[PDB]
Amino acid sequence: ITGTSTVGVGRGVLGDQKNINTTYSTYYYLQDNTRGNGIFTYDAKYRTTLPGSLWADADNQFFASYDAPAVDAHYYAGVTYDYYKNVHNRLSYDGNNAAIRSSVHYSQGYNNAFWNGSQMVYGDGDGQTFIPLSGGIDVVAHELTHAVTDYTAGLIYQNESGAINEAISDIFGTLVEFYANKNPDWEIGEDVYTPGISGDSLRSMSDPAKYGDPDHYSKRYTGTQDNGGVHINSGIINKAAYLISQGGTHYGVSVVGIGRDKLGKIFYRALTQYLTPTSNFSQLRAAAVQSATDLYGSTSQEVASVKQAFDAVGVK
Numbered sequence: 477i478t479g480t481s482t483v484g485v486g487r488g489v490l491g492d493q494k495n496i497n498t499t500y501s502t503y504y505y506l507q508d509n510t511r512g513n514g515i516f517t518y519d520a521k522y523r524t525t526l527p528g529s530l531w532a533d534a535d536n537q538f539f540a541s542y543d544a545p546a547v548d549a550h551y552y553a554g555v556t557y558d559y560y561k562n563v564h565n566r567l568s569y570d571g572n573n574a575a576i577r578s579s580v581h582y583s584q585g586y587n588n589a590f591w592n593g594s595q596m597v598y599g600d601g602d603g604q605t606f607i608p609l610s611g612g613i614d615v616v617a618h619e620l621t622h623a624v625t626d627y628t629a630g631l632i633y634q635n636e637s638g639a640i641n642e643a644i645s646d647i648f649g650t651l652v653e654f655y656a657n658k659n660p661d662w663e664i665g666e667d668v669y670t671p672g673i674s675g676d677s678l679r680s681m682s683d684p685a686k687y688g689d690p691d692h693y694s695k696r697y698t699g700t701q702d703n704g705g706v707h708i709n710s711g712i713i714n715k716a717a718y719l720i721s722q723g724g725t726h727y728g729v730s731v732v733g734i735g736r737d738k739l740g741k742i743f744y745r746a747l748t749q750y751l752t753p754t755s756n757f758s759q760l761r762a763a764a765v766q767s768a769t770d771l772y773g774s775t776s777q778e779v780a781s782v783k784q785a786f787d788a789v790g791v792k
């Protein structure tokens with residue numbers, strides 16, 4: 477909407493206060509004009525029609541319980557925008573400052589979040605498996621990263637290409653979580669998963685097997701559930717990424733860590749210059765090797781560590 481840029485204050489899903497960029501025109505809207513061609517947050521009102529209505533508020537204060545998922549979807553979309561722009565020189569998901577749109581309060585008891593081809597969508601959860609999913613910065617960045625992938629490599633959402641697609645979203649979700657630097661970890665979704673159980677998460681990148689997911693290619697899922705295991709076999713690539721960054725010895729194969737920033741550079745280059753819609757795990761290895769070679773040189777530690785990490789997870 478046309479109006480003037482304003483700054484509201486509110487509380488997120490986990491009770492923390494934050495400032496948000498809004499727009500004033502009669503009402504205060506969740507419309508952040510400070511980033512690209514805007515970040516827009518919508519109320520889906522417990523229904524499944526999308527996007528719903530652009531979030532309107534009478535006083536620019538967002539402390540009601542109903543407001544909390546909107547505050548966090550809006551704020552964490554801004555952090556994710558900043559990560560891509562400041563770290564990778566990428567302007568929004570399309571590289572051309574496309575408007576970023578999210579809807580919260582999607583459906584009833586909805587234990588998921590997704591990119592629908594055009595926008596982000598967040599359930600409120602059922603209060604048992606999830607609380608409102610925009611409360612996790614890694615979740616928000618995971619969702620926006622699907623849009624980045626779709627505009628770049630275009631990885632088809634099934635089988636190995638789909639597991640790479642998933643891992644890319646978990647990798648960058650985690651790197652955004654570290655960028656914001658509030659309780660960062662290599663776990664996925666811990667802030668919004670299972671409020672009655674402490675210390676768990678939806679997935680682990682450091683130890684995927686803790687939540688049933690494979691940590692070696694020989695343990696990959698080969699059935700048809702979950703689009704051929706896209707949220708399962710992502711563990712193999714997540715583990716490789718974790719090892720590239722942090723190092724370790726895994727199934728007897730030692731990996732020298734090179735740190736998060738270089739991990740992000742390697743994978744961003746692979747995603748945007750080398751991967752294609754049908755890339756498989758072996759082709760991802762090749763793309764990561766080539767990316768590290770471009771950035772750091774063929775004889776570099778970074779190239780050697782990429783090879784070590786894919787060896788450790790059984791991907792040649």
Ligand SMILES: CC(C)C[C@H](NP(=O)(O)CNC(=O)OCc1ccccc1)C(=O)NC[C@H](C)C(C)(C)C
Binds near residue numbers: 589590609665
């Ligand atoms: C980070 C996590 C909290 C949320 C993430 N959602 P996502 O991976 O973004 C789902 N996306 C999806 O299914 O996209 C396909 C598509 C394409 C077009 C329109 C609509 C949909 C996820 O890991 N979901 C897995 C869920 C919870 C289980 C039940 C399978 C374990």
Ligand SMILES: [Ca+2]
Binds near residue numbers: 538
């Ligand atoms: Ca208000």
Ligand SMILES: [Ca+2]
Binds near residue numbers: 653658660661666
């Ligand atoms: Ca965390």
Ligand SMILES: [Ca+2]
Binds near residue numbers: 666
């Ligand atoms: Ca996390």
Ligand SMILES: [Ca+2]
Binds near residue numbers: 666670672675676677
């Ligand atoms: Ca929990």
Ligand SMILES: [Zn+2]
Binds near residue numbers: 618622642645
């Ligand atoms: Zn995903």
